[PDB]
Amino acid sequence: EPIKVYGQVSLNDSHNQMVVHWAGEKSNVIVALARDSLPKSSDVYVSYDYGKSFKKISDKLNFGLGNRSEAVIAQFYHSPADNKRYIFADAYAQYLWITFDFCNTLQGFSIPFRAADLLLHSKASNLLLGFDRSHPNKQLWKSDDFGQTWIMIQEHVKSFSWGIDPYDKPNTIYIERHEPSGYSTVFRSTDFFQSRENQEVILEEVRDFQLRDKYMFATKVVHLLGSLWVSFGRKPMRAAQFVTRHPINEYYIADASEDQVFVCVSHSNNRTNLYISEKFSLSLENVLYYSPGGAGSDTLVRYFANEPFADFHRVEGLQGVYIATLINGNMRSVITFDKGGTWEFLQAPAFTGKINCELSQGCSLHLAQRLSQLLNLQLRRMPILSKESAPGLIIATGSVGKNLASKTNVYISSSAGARWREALPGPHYYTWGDHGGIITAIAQGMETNELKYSTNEGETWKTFIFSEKPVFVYGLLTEPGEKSTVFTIFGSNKENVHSWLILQVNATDALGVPCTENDYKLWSPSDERGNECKTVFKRRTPHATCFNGEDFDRPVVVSNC
Amino acid sequence: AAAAAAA
Ligand SMILES: *[C@@H]1O[C@H](CO)[C@@H](O)[C@H](O)[C@H]1NC(C)=O
Ligand SMILES: *[C@@H]1O[C@H](CO)[C@@H](O)[C@H](O)[C@H]1NC(C)=O
Ligand SMILES: *[C@@H]1O[C@H](CO)[C@@H](O)[C@H](O)[C@H]1NC(C)=O
Numbered sequence: 001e002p003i004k005v006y007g008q009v010s011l012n013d014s015h016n017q018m019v020v021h022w023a024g025e026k027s028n029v030i031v032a033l034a035r036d037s038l039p040k041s042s043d044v045y046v047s048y049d050y051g052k053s054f055k056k057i058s059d060k061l062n063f064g065l066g067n068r069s070e071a072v073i074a075q076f077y078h079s080p081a082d083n084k085r086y087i088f089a090d091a092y093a094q095y096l097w098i099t100f101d102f103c104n105t106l107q108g109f110s111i112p113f114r115a116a117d118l119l120l121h122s123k124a125s126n127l128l129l130g131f132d133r134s135h136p137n138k139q140l141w142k143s144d145d146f147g148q149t150w151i152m153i154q155e156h157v158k159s160f161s162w163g164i165d166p167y168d169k170p171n172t173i174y175i176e177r178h179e180p181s182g183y184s185t186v187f188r189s190t191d192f193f194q195s196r197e198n199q200e201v202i203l204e205e206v207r208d209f210q211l212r213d214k215y216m217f218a219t220k221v222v223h224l225l226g227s228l229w230v231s232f233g234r235k236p237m238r239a240a241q242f243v244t245r246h247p248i249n250e251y252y253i254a255d256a257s258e259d260q261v262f263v264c265v266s267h268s269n270n271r272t273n274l275y276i277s278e279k280f281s282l283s284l285e286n287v288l289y290y291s292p293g294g295a296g297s298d299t300l301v302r303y304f305a306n307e308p309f310a311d312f313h314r315v316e317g318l319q320g321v322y323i324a325t326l327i328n329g330n331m332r333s334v335i336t337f338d339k340g341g342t343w344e345f346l347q348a349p350a351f352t353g354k355i356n357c358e359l360s361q362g363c364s365l366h367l368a369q370r371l372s373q374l375l376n377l378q379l380r381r382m383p384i385l386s387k388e389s390a391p392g393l394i395i396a397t398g399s400v401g402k403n404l405a406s407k408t409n410v411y412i413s414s415s416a417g418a419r420w421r422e423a424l425p426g427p428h429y430y431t432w433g434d435h436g437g438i439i440t441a442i443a444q445g446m447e448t449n450e451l452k453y454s455t456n457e458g459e460t461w462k463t464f465i466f467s468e469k470p471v472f473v474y475g476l477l478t479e480p481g482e483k484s485t486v487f488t489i490f491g492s493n494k495e496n497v498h499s500w501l502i503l504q505v506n507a508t509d510a511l512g513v514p515c516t517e518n519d520y521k522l523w524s525p526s527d528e529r530g531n532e533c534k535t536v537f538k539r540r541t542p543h544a545t546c547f548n549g550e551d552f553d554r555p556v557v558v559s560n561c
Numbered sequence: 562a563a564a565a566a567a568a
């Protein structure tokens with residue numbers, strides 16, 4: 001058989017929420033937190049054979065003898081610097097558990113505060129920050145020994161983050177401290193606020209603060225009487241000019257890369273618009289946007305989203321290609337291969353696997369995203385998928401016509417969106433592995449035991465039966481980076497209902513053989529719509545059945561055309 | 562049963 005089921009693990013677990021981490025440094029370690037929606041109880045599991053088997057380690061999370069009482073894990077944290085180490089915060093007690101060895105050994109520690117929210121440094125593996133949210137003071141804490149001892153470094157804090165290397169020096173911290181106005185002022189220290197000399201105000205009386213790569217952002221409120229601020233390369237913050245006749249109510253940073261910023265602007269009228277810096281020219285108007293305030297506040301979403309967001313997708317591996325949703329009353333999708341320079345209607349596929357659709361008539365391909373999905377109640381449905389591991393490969397759920405229907409299919413383009421095909425009729429979970437070399441999908445709704453997969457960019461599909469009995473499926477995932485050919489199917493057996501189930505599917509033999517240079521082509525988004533200006537990617541030709549390795553290192557060449 | 566998350 002082309003596909004092996006590497007492991008079937010029936011955790012005897014009835015928790016509704018499942019959080020999964022891959023240590024993933026070629027360590028076959030996988031950590032899983034089973035818990036309640038956001039908590040009454042929890043169970044932590046761990047695999048060392050890459051999901052072949054799972055050891056339940058909840059009993060190792062205790063407060064010692066003389067204190068039998070069971071613990072409840074709210075969240076668990078990983079070190080971005082050292083995948084060996086993890087931290088487990090109790091939800092109710094001011095207590096931790098630390099690990100330096102892939103959870104083979106844990107140490108129960110008391111802490112001065114409840115571990116509501118922790119932030120681990122990306123480089124200094126022993127260094128982290130802590131926050132007590134339901135503490136009247138809003139205290140911020142620091143640890144140098146990876147969470148064993150703590151000290152308090154600030155009070156009345158609204159938000160905070162680490163600096164961003166290399167832009168900010170090591171130990172840099174940005175925070176919003178609450179002002180009696182109810183507003184906040186943004187600080188920056190390197191002495192962890194033990195030194196006034198290194199403490200440094202960067203803005204005054206600001207509504208919100210966002211740190212993004214080179215740029216920094218913040219909304220200043222100016223109340224006039226007669227009836228946003230930007231940093232660039234850390235140069236002091238100055239307000240940006242906007243070309244409008246209508247007043248502005250809400251700001252949102254859609255995408256940040258050096259030299260071009262995408263900002264959604266929602267007005268009094270509840271119309272939302274898109275601007276681009278380098279000073280903000282108008283790119284696109286009436287973009288589907290939400291804020292709690294809010295542009296779409298009245299509706300359903302309010303009970304689902306507390307933080308604003310917009311139907312605006314950046315195709316990840318690329319520069320310049322985005323996909324957004326437009327609304328009037330009434331949803332439609334538009335794509336730009338320029339960074340908002342021009343926009344376009346998404347050309348529907350040429351067949352079904354045939355069908356008629358034309359831009360002049362008024363119909364185009366329409367892709368359902370995060371926001372539009374909640375409105376049509378597509379709670380579990382997939383947002384647009386695009387990853388740097390597979391440049392110019394996009395899979396999405398959407399419809400063909402003049403409007404996003406309730407009826408939706410799966411659409412694929414290995415053309416950065418310029419050309420689409422109809423891949424799957426229903427809605428499916430989907431993901432991919434081996435740097436886009438292989439695509440798996442599973443049907444949403446009725447319980448299945450079919451794993452549809454494809455090696456030629458969705459052109460054809462094959463079915464693999466992964467279970468003798470059909471199971472409900474809650475998710476289909478890969479180790480991030482999508483280099484492996486292992487796919488994890490999360491699901492539950494039929495009644496007795498809701499017993500978590502983790503199937504580990506291994507699809508190398510679908511690919512079969514290591515790729516050679518014969519199966520590689522050069523390709524730039526320029527090739528698709530142009531030539532126009534570039535970045536050139538080596539891609540496996542679509543019809544090549546083989547695998548680039550897990551250690552595949554995609555060669556990208558940047559050039560002045 | 563509800564959902565599965567990364568992170
Ligand atoms: C167990 O430990 C936590 C903190 O160490 C403490 O708050 C709790 O009171 C202990 N259990 C009991 C029986 O109270
Ligand atoms: C809004 O919809 C109406 C009809 O539903 C149409 O006449 C009008 O052109 C639309 N406005 C925009 C901005 O597309
Ligand atoms: C998965 O299966 C393929 C082919 O059966 C094999 O080469 C590979 O070593 C396996 N990988 C894992 C993680 O078991």
Ligand SMILES: *[C@@H]1O[C@H](CO)[C@@H](O)[C@H](O)[C@H]1NC(C)=O
Binds near residue numbers: 559560
């Ligand atoms: C390509 O040209 C740009 C400006 O035209 C320049 O900044 C860059 O250094 C050039 N690339 C290389 C590799 O020199």
